[PDB]
Amino acid sequence: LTEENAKTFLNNFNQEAEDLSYQSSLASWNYNTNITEENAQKMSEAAAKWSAFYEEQSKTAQSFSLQEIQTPIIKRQLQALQQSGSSALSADKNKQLNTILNTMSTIYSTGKVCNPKNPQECLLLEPGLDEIMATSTDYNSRLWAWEGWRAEVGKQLRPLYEEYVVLKNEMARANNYNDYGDYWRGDYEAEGADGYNYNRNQLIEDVERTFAEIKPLYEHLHAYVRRKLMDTYPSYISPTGCLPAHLLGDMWGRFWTNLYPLTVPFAQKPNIDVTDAMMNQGWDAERIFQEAEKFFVSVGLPHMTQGFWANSMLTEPADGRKVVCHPTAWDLGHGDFRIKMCTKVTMDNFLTAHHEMGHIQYDMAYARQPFLLRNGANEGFHEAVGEIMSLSAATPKHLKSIGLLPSDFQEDSETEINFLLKQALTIVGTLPFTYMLEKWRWMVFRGEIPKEQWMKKWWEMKREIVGVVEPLPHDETYCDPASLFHVSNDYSFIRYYTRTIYQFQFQEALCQAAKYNGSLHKCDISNSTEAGQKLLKMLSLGNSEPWTKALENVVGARNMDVKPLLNYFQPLFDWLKEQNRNSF
Amino acid sequence: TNLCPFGEVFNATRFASVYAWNRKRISNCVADYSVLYNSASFSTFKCYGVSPTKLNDLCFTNVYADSFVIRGDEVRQIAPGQTGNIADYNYKLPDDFTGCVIAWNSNNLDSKVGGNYNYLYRLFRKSNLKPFERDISTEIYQAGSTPCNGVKGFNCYFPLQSYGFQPTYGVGYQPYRVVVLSFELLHAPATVC
Ligand SMILES: *[C@@H]1O[C@H](CO)[C@@H](O[C@@H]2O[C@H](CO)[C@@H](O)[C@H](O)[C@H]2NC(C)=O)[C@H](O)[C@H]1NC(C)=O
Ligand SMILES: *[C@@H]1O[C@H](CO)[C@@H](O)[C@H](O)[C@H]1NC(C)=O
């Protein structure tokens, strides 16, 4: 009692966890720098030790029953440590259960797939050549080259998954909850006082009423793309059926390697050749990054550590000395705060740099709330922080006021359309996918009927939503969420959903307090301290205060608000709305 | 003429811990303070109630030198009318005291690769420590689920933990080397000047 046993157990938890996390981060660093596979063996050993020790902590969480009489603030930590997690179960069941996902992944890296009936340009499905060997608009020699590939993958995915889904039902039966689908959403509850509890089904009540009034947003998007496909050659869209799905190259709807260039219908305006005109100056990776601190001295945020600029790895290799190059920012535990990205100099390199720059500044805000709140405060804000600053820095007037772009070339009123076409494209085509997918994902593990009737209704749903169909349907040898390294391995998938809304919420939050007349698109970041002052306090909250109470105090928000998103582009939605009356 | 060797005390070889530290005696010596004033190597040389110019002219019967190592952030938290884990369970200063505190940085010497775990800390005690405390006893913490009779049950666990040290840590958590000067006046003659 008197919160000494809990304090001491949690402090020992903090010490051991910091040591283990620092060891694991150091092992990751040594692995990605001096790979020898015994560093990876020690990685596995330390991870197994950490897991077993954490399971013992979960067992020792049976140390004090709670009931209701207490009203402390440490109750969040109490339930976090008492969380069952992967604990319990027989030592035989989960011991073979955890040996499934890794051995599933082995059939992917060892497989070799290249151009069929073409010994030339034959190479593995890797992004080095995939961009040009897959995302090319070809019709005759591409139709039958992917059915075989996606039937070869799905040869054993149905028989494996039909047992996998029922074998994971053991965690559903011993998770102290009732349904595996609701297990994920059962950890989002935020209560600090009466009237600020999160209702489990608040989403299904509020969002679904508002989804009806936004219908015309989607039907007319299809009328835009037909301005190009129907214009060139009269063999893409057959009148009997609907538009094809193979020539696009990516059914995931994330990147467009050929739609993006040929996007503006008029194509008379001059594009931007900034990189060609700036390569002569000498702006390399080290010469680039100074913009962040030049902004932040005007804002007031703390500078980076000596190790931050001592650990860059922005130099070219000598001869073919490749490494694992991916966007990865890590906390690395006890105040390390290191960024790792081996980047060259390109135009999109600017869009890269700020995006992971935001992560470390956001992390350097809640370091005073131990390891209890050093975790991610919210699943959506983590990427929103990285992307909001970047999109704001993407302002042409921002990039002109520094002294680089001549004032003779004044800004125009039609190029913002070209700027924002892809920005409004990439973050709009995913929301219906995710909303259908997550709810029906929680529906399908109930198993009312196996999966040989859902695909039939899938096509009817798609036709009544957008009207997409292929002339000769395939057989049942597929699984959409299976061939994905970020889905099959069971990560958080609403994290690719939430980031669209909160960025616009915070952009509106700044633009309503930026004291700017005229339009609402000319919001600029430089030379502003009040915004940073009001922002740092929100960053430095963590799991201490519910987001509901925080948003109430800031502006008033019981739930999500998308009408900022609607009204921030409705003055630009005239083109999508009124010019599209001659088609359905 | 006949100066008191502060250098061997400061630039030592084997270093003191925070839970087993011992006093150092200064008697029959001469004071040389301009070196400290213009040392030019001082992380935090701040102290109130004494002025360095006239500190040369002051003489005291007994002088105790205290040196220890703590986390860089809490170097200024050691003061009268202060709190914290170190203040309440590891080391506390009398409020009436009016000496001076000096901070150094020893990353180039103290730290190493591998997280030197020799340095420790004493957290477990039933109460707060009286000022100027030194004990070798390790009295049983009165927390016996039922007996703590050397049995690992409830509230009975290992009380000693480490403090890792690598150069990769942040500046605020780098090990700072801190020395404490004790000043007091005794009726006995003051041969230290
Ligand atoms: C990474 O650093 C090590 C440190 O010397 C380099 O040499 C390895 O050292 C370990 C430990 O002494 C030996 O067990 C290995 O046999 C050494 N050679 C290796 C791992 O190839 C190592 O060469 C460095 N790695 C790279 C890629 O430069
Ligand atoms: C202590 O630091 C170094 C290491 O011994 C030494 O060279 C220096 O002269 C000393 N500082 C003094 C004597 O003030």
Author numbering:
A (entry chain A): 20 to 603
B (entry chain B): 333 to 525
Reproduce text from the manuscript describing this model:
Here we report the cryo-EM structures of mouse ACE2 bound to trimeric Spike ectodomains of four different VOC: Beta, Omicron BA.1, Omicron BA.2.12.1 and Omicron BA.4/5. All of our structures show that mACE2/hACE2 bind the RBD of the Spike protein in the same manner at the binding interface of a RBD in the up-position. The RBD is highly mobile and its transition between the down- to its up- state reveals the ACE2 binding site and allows for it to bind ACE2. To gain structural information at side-chain level resolution of the binding interface, we performed image processing of the cryo-EM data by location-focused refinement on an ACE2-bound RBD that was the most well resolved.
The first mutation reported to be crucial for mACE2 engagement and shared by the Alpha, Beta and Gamma and the more recent Omicron variants is the N501Y mutation. In the mACE2/Beta structure, we observe that the Spike N501Y mutation which replaces a polar asparagine (N) residue with a polar and aromatic tyrosine (Y) residue, allows for π-π interactions with Y41 of mACE2, and enables a new cation-π and hydrogen bond interaction with histidine H353 of mACE2. These new interactions stabilize the interface between mACE2 and the Beta RBD. These two residues are unfortunately not resolved in our cryo-EM maps. However, in vitro BLI experiments showed that while the introduction of either N501Y, K417N or the E484K mutations alone are not sufficient to confer binding to mACE2, at the concentration of Spike protein tested here (75 nM), the combination of Y501 and K484 led to appreciable binding of the mutant Spike to mACE2. The emergence of the N501Y mutation found in the receptor binding domain (RBD) of the Spike protein of Alpha, Beta and Gamma variants has been associated with mice susceptibility to infection. To our knowledge, there has been no reported structure of the Beta Spike bound to a non-human ACE2. Our cryo-EM structure illuminates how a single mutation, N501Y, allows for new interactions especially with the mACE2-unique residue H353 via cation- π interactions, analogous to K353 as observed with Alpha, Beta and Gamma Spike bound hACE2..
